[PDB]
Amino acid sequence: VRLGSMLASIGQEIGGVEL
Amino acid sequence: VRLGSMLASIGQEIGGVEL
Amino acid sequence: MILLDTNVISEPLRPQPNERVVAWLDSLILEDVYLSAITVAELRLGVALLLNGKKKNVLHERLEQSILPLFAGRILPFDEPVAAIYAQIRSYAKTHGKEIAAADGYIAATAKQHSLTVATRDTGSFFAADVAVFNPWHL
Amino acid sequence: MILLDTNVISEPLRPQPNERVVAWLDSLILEDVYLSAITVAELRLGVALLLNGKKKNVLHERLEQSILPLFAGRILPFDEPVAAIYAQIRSYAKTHGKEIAAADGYIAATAKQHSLTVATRDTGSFFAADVAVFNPWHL
Ligand SMILES: [Mg+2]
Ligand SMILES: [Mg+2]
Ligand SMILES: [Mg+2]
Ligand SMILES: [Mg+2]
Ligand SMILES: [Mg+2]
Ligand SMILES: [Mg+2]
C-alpha cells in the first residue's frame, strides 16, 4: 500500500544506510 | 557452421571496423 | 506506470530521508511500479558492500524477504528488445552532443521499451534519452 | 558451452583480424554459443556510432539480418537471477582486492548463471569472478 513508509521503516530499524 | 569465417566475410566486404 | 531508479528506492533507507520523496512513493499504486533488473543488481551490490556486518545481514534479509517481494512479477530484464532501444538512445545522444552513461542508458531503454516514466533524482541523462521522467524531490 | 564477449565476436570484423581467433570461432558448434543481451547492446551501439554513413548502413543490415539470427533463441537476458549472481561476484571481488567493472560483471554473472565459459581477450575480471574463461588469442 504505502511503499515509501514501508522502506523508511526498514531504514530506521537498521540505523540508515547509503545505497 | 563456420562462425568466424561468416564474420570475417562481413568485415571484408565493408572494409573492416572497430567494435 | 513508473520505473524506480536506484537513487529513489534507496532514499527512504537513509538516516534522514527526504520526506517529500517518501510521501511521493506512498501515493503510488504498487502494481504500477516497476524495477529494472539492473537496479536490483545495484541494490544487492550496495548491501553486500556494507562495512557493518550486522547491518548488512539485517538489510540483506529485508531486501530479499520484504522489499523485493513487493515487486514480484515486475522486475524487468535487460533483454534483446531493450538492447535495440539502448543502442538507439545512446547513439542518438552521442551524435547530438548529449551525455548518457551506460548504467543510465540501461534504465532508460527499459523504461522506453515498457512505456514507463523513470523516477530519479538525476534527470539529465533521461531527458537526453527522450524518455519521460519524474524527480520526486520536486512537486 | 560458450558466452562470447564483445571483443571476440568483433575481432573478425576488423581490417586484419587475428587468424587464430577466426579459426577458433570456426571450430565451435553454433548451437553451443551464446550472446548476452549486454553484448548485443554494445555491438549495436558500436555500429550506430560509426563515422562512415555507408559503412554503418551496410553493417547495420548485416548485424541485424545476418549475424544476430545465428543466435536466435540464444541471446541471454540480464534478469533477476543474474542480478543476484552479479552482486555476489562483484562484492566478493571487492572484499578480496580484486577488480571487476560493471560491464564485465554483467557478462560474468550471465555466464555463471548459465554454466558457460566466457570467451574474451581480457580474462582479468572474469578470473576474479570465479567464472570459466577462454582467451582465443591463445591455443
Ligand atoms: Mg529500475
Ligand atoms: Mg546483497
Ligand atoms: Mg532492465
Ligand atoms: Mg556475451
Ligand atoms: Mg545499431
Ligand atoms: Mg545478459
CSV table of N, CA, C and O and ligand atoms in Angstrom, one decimal, chain D residues 3-6 34-40 107, ligand 4:
chain,number,residue,atom,x,y,z
D,3,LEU,N,30.0,-18.3,-24.0
D,3,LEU,CA,29.4,-17.0,-24.0
D,3,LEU,C,30.4,-16.1,-24.6
D,3,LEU,O,31.5,-15.8,-24.0
D,4,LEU,N,30.2,-15.6,-25.8
D,4,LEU,CA,31.2,-14.7,-26.5
D,4,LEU,C,31.1,-13.3,-26.0
D,4,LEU,O,30.1,-12.7,-26.1
D,5,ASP,N,32.3,-12.7,-25.6
D,5,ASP,CA,32.4,-11.4,-25.1
D,5,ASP,C,32.5,-10.5,-26.3
D,5,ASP,O,32.8,-11.0,-27.4
D,6,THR,N,32.2,-9.2,-26.2
D,6,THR,CA,32.2,-8.3,-27.3
D,6,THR,C,33.5,-8.3,-28.1
D,6,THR,O,33.5,-8.2,-29.4
D,34,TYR,N,26.5,-18.7,-27.1
D,34,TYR,CA,25.5,-17.7,-26.7
D,34,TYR,C,26.1,-16.3,-26.7
D,34,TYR,O,27.3,-16.0,-26.7
D,35,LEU,N,25.1,-15.3,-26.6
D,35,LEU,CA,25.5,-13.9,-26.5
D,35,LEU,C,24.7,-13.3,-25.4
D,35,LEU,O,23.5,-13.7,-25.2
D,36,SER,N,25.2,-12.4,-24.6
D,36,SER,CA,24.5,-11.7,-23.5
D,36,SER,C,23.8,-10.6,-24.2
D,36,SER,O,24.3,-10.0,-25.2
D,37,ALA,N,22.6,-10.2,-23.8
D,37,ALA,CA,21.9,-9.1,-24.3
D,37,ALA,C,22.7,-7.8,-24.2
D,37,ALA,O,22.6,-6.9,-24.9
D,38,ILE,N,23.6,-7.8,-23.2
D,38,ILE,CA,24.5,-6.7,-22.9
D,38,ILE,C,25.5,-6.5,-24.1
D,38,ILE,O,25.8,-5.4,-24.5
D,39,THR,N,26.1,-7.6,-24.6
D,39,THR,CA,27.0,-7.7,-25.7
D,39,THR,C,26.3,-7.2,-27.0
D,39,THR,O,26.8,-6.5,-27.8
D,40,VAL,N,25.0,-7.7,-27.2
D,40,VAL,CA,24.3,-7.3,-28.3
D,40,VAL,C,24.0,-5.8,-28.3
D,40,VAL,O,24.1,-5.1,-29.3
D,107,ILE,N,28.4,-9.6,-17.8
D,107,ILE,CA,28.7,-10.8,-18.6
D,107,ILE,C,29.1,-11.9,-17.8
D,107,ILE,O,28.6,-13.0,-18.0
E,4,MG,MG,28.1,-12.1,-24.5
